[PDB]
Amino acid sequence: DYEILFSDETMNYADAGTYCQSRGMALVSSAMRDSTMVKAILAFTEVKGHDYWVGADNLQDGAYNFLWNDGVSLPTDSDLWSPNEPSNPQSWQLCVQIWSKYNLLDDVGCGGARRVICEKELD
Amino acid sequence: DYEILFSDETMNYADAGTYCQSRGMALVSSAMRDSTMVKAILAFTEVKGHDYWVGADNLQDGAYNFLWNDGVSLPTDSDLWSPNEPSNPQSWQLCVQIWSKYNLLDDVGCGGARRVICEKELD
Ligand SMILES: [Ca+2]
Ligand SMILES: [Ca+2]
Ligand SMILES: [Ca+2]
Ligand SMILES: [Ca+2]
Ligand SMILES: [Zn+2]
Ligand SMILES: [Zn+2]
Ligand SMILES: [Zn+2]
Ligand SMILES: [Zn+2]
Ligand SMILES: [Zn+2]
Ligand SMILES: [Zn+2]
Ligand SMILES: [Zn+2]
């Protein structure tokens, strides 16, 4: 169960995190691992057909050691990934987005402007 | 362009309005009249398969004089309505929801608990 916020305003990955945080929420993460919720989230972004930041990156352990912001691993072989991703140089700082080309996850550098999705676990 | 918040938390119609307002947003209304956004919004609720409040009611003008909270009319013949709705007695105070049966609009009394959708136009 969640509160999911979608924003058409774009920002880099760091700013997306603080954007959600300032609202008492977090960049979407656990909701992406929830089979019902992730399906609803992707149904929305599918219509929008735009890139969105999600709360995962390799900043801590590097390479393809992707972590959701709540500390849970985003397996390199997850079905959430777009075909042939992740594929950027493992030595880069990598952030994860919902890539419009496939409406599935993708590794990118962290400076590009993208839309934002925030979550808040209920209760 | 907008900010759209979906919440699994249920409430009556009045409480949904206050819920959105306390967040600097409004019960979804103009976004429902936007061709891209309404489809994105409905794609999300389709997956969820649950009832959601929307920002429309007959409280100012009564009967089937439905108005979106921003004062714009919700035509009784809108393609947004579920088949054979609106159909509740015109003497009642009627509120509008996204009804899970069709994933389309429907008139109901205002006291039932339903999920909430808030919006915030972005300029
Ligand atoms: Ca794959
Ligand atoms: Ca990539
Ligand atoms: Ca009709
Ligand atoms: Ca009805
Ligand atoms: Zn769940
Ligand atoms: Zn802007
Ligand atoms: Zn892109
Ligand atoms: Zn509860
Ligand atoms: Zn629009
Ligand atoms: Zn725009
Ligand atoms: Zn119902």
Swiss-Prot record, chains A, B:
SMART domains per the UniProt record, alphabetical: CLECT
Keywords, sorted A to Z: Calcium, Disulfide bond, Lectin
Disulphide connectivity of cysteines: C20-C118, C95-C110
PROSITE patterns: C_TYPE_LECTIN_1, C_TYPE_LECTIN_2
Residue span, C-type lectin domain: 1-119
Keyword Disulfide bond assigned: yes
An MF annotation (GO) of this entry: carbohydrate binding
Matches recorded under CDD domains: CLECT_TC14_like (cd03601)
Statement: the UniProt record of this protein carries the keyword Cell membrane: no
UniProt xrefs under PANTHER family: C-TYPE LECTIN DOMAIN-CONTAINING PROTEIN, LITHOSTATHINE
Protein's job: Role in the defense system of the organism against microorganisms. This calcium-binding lectin binds galactose.
Subunit structure: Homodimer.
Protein known as: Lectin
Native organism: Polyandrocarpa misakiensis
Phylogenetic lineage: Eukaryota, Metazoa, Chordata, Tunicata, Ascidiacea
